[PDB]
Symmetry: D2
Subunit: 187 residues, 4 copies
């Protein structure tokens, strides 16, 4: 019908440009919200103010925290198996996620496939990563300096930090011994 | 009424959560963009992905630079008078502004007030500031340590740096002798 | 006593100030380093360049990563007991830490307190936090909206995100104490 | 070698440690690079130990500089007198800010001498005269324009560029502010 943005927030954006609401042609408002014909109209104002569109929605989505915190339950959220050409590779389970840090992706992974399983590196991630081995023994492989493959074995209680965009893979060291890790991507 | 989100961007957000476009119920798309019925539909997806609405437009604004640069012309952009409690204080003129740094607000100001008029401090602001005097003699007043008023006179070629949230005011030292400054707010 | 600063780095700093090494009094150098008589001499140059002393060492710490990565082993690093007002609260064990992200503090904690002991909240901290329960049942208490105490129980596989500066405490839900958590502080 | 106690305690707290010499306000390191060892042990870079410990050069939230009051020099690039560089206010509260006033001395009769670009963003404003600006654009192609009094330009990091007089013999002036 109409696209709403928070008045106070929009007024602060205008103030960084030394403007007020009067400097916007023909928008309507009420006590708390400013109304736009649609995204296209909003884009035009954004262009005029030389602010990117994203800024106009910052802080508009309601926090999903309760009292400064958010709780998630085992087996409670998103989960799926990862199966590639008939080979069961991972179980991916979301741990707590929040709209107060969309850059945080915390996972619990079951590692299902073995030694006769082929290498399938990722392309690396913009996020930093720390991984901790909750159970079993885990083969970690990654692409090091001068694009050379490296490897090591992480046992229960070991951990690893991985810089952005380093390509890497986690598999069971033994096979038939299913291992588990927690992987936290951030920043 | 329809809302467009960049497909590649949205696909990257979904991939960090180990999802694909198939995991979104009733969206349509084309080669480059994903379409939502309206804000209400978008808010649902945001909820489902536990991301704020702003994230869907992050990075997606087209640069307003041409070849790494952007040029602005005297009197070419926004301008207005600033009147504070009945006293004509400034003329604000925008210098170059760019969506590649929405936090940069560079201004040319004419000064209109003086000692015959009452002081009208601002409340300070988040941005750092450097000011340079292009013409005339400028009385600067600000709130210092222990909330005490301070003052000095800046002549042509002098400059001043102001820490965030220090309240301040620039007026003509002589009065009827109209002065000019450049103010650059950043960060 | 003979303080060394990286030459290339110092040259870049000088270049931002439109200076060269010739504009520094009384420093000697070699191919890779610039030498100062002492802190007193360095503090003078810092004053002259209007930079803080810290800047002279920014980026100059050698990375502790090997090939983009760093590995730590269970029981391989720092640990200590935490006793708060006479109550044995935690065992803190460092997981991997790196000088490439000093804001990342990943810990494994043993929990030693319960309800038969008094509450000992921390003061909160600047870092975001995600915690995951590896073993047992964990009472989590925190200070919520309007400074009211809140509580919940986290079981094995549950996780929790805590916003910066929210004061909080983790104890065993069941008296007779040994639950375990992984706590990752970041950003 | 002295470090602020409060600051060091906060650093130790991020590693779940405490002071495991000092006085009320400061902590002392004997080896002078005894400090590098502790930094290594905490896996914090050395620089962090001095953050916030240089005394502010502001007076009451502000810092004032005067024309001709600070650093100044001539810039001669290939036997060609190119700029006069004059520092405007500089502060240790933002070591990333370099604000300059430049007199321009070269023109089209003299060869082009681009810089290599730099890490800072830049905004420039023309206080006097007419200024020829040349820069390296997309696909490493040269571009040019003329900026008159009151015009301004924003330059992305690492774009190589040059400012000269458009007319020549007609000496122009700019203010250049580098930040972030
Ligand atoms: C010129 C500028 O510093 C005054 P204000 O716009 O912040 O009040
Ligand atoms: C486990 C962690 O949240 C406790 P602390 O950081 O308050 O010591
Ligand atoms: C005005 C200034 O940008 C010229 P350069 O000193 O960076 O080459
Ligand atoms: Mn201001
Ligand atoms: Mn904590
Ligand atoms: Mn420059």
């Amino acid at each position: 019908r109409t696209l709403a943005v928070g008045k106070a927030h929009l007024e602060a954006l205008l103030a960084t440009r030394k403007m007020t609401l009067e400097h916007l042609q023909d928008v309507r408002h009420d006590a708390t919200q400013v109304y736009f014909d649609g995204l296209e109209h909003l884009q035009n104002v954004a262009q005029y103010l030389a602010i990117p569109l994203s800024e106009f929605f910052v802080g508009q989505t309601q926090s999903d925290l309760d009292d400064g915190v958010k709780i998630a339950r085992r087996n409670g959220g998103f989960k799926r198996e990862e199966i590639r050409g008939g080979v069961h590779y991972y179980t991916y389970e979301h741990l707590v996620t929040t709209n107060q840090d969309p850059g945080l992706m915390a996972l619990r992974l079951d590692l299902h496939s073995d030694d006769e399983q082929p290498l399938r590196l990722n392309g690396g991630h913009g996020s930093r990563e720390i991984v901790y081995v909750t159970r079993g023994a885990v083969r970690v492989r990654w692409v090091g300096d001068n694009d050379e493959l490296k490897e090591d074995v992480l046992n229960e209680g070991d951990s690893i930090f991985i810089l952005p965009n380093v390509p890497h893979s986690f598999t069971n060291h033994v096979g038939g011994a299913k291992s588990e890790i927690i992987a936290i991507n951030y920043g």
